[PDB]
Amino acid sequence: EEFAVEKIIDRRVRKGMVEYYLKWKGYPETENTWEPENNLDCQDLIQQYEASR
Amino acid sequence: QTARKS
């Protein structure tokens, strides 16, 4: 159940754990989901998001 | 550039 990530939309902390709001490649924006940081294999996207905030 | 979807 791993899927291609298009971009990181947002970031939050919930219950002490960092979560990223993801747009999934090839899926509509209605399918965007919040995922815990350890669910991601997107070092390029994460570093770009964190550098750009 | 992938992620697990919970």
CB environment B1-6: b (16+ within 10 A), e (fewer): eebeee
Amino acid at A37: E
Method: X-ray
Beta-carbon separation of B1 and A42 below 8 A:
yes
A43: enclosing H helix or E strand: helix A43-52
A21 to chain B, any CB pair closer than 8 A? The answer is no
Among B5, B6, A12, B1, residue whose Cα is nearest residue A46? B1
Domains of chain A: 1-53 (2.40.50.40)
List, as ranges, residues 1-6 from B with C-beta within 8 Å of A. Answer: 1-6
